[PDB]
Amino acid sequence: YVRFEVPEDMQNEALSLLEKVRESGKVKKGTNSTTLAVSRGLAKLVYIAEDVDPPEIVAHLPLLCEEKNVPYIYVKSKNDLGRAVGRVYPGASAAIINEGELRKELGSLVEKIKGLQ
């Protein structure tokens, strides 16, 4: 249930900004903490995996992000989301809570994502 389709280069930009934010920022991984972070108005930018089965697990996300005005982006695999923070483990969804040092980069990314809508 993709709301939009992100092109490959933009997906790579987001997945790379994720690894750069790892150090100086704060990132959560998993559907529980990500949903909480969006509901509490903490998530700067959320990532949703495309290969989630059953897809109903992450389906509630885009509408909640629209409710709370949180930019969401679809990434190809949940394994591409496994390096988000801490232990290497697959993640159906993640969320950058603090941009950290990469402020303008996240700004450009959310501009490009809004461009897709």
Partner RNA sequence: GGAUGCAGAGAACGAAAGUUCCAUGACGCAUCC
Of positions 14, 27, 46, 52, contacts RNA by CB under 7 A: 52
Of positions 25, 28, 70, 73, contacts RNA by CB under 7 A: 28
Least separation in angstroms between CB 103 and RNA: 23
Distance CA 25, CA 100 (A): 4
For the four alpha carbons of 31, 91, 38 and 60, in that order, the dihedral sign comes to negative
Distance CA 90, CA 88 (A): 7
Least separation in angstroms between CB 59 and RNA: 12
Tokens 């559907």 belong to which residue?
Answer: 31
53 binds RNA (CB under 7 A): yes
31 binds RNA (CB under 7 A): yes
Beta bridge partners of 93: 48
Rule CB under 7 A: which residues touch RNA?
A: 28-34, 36, 51-54, 57, 78, 85-87, 89-93
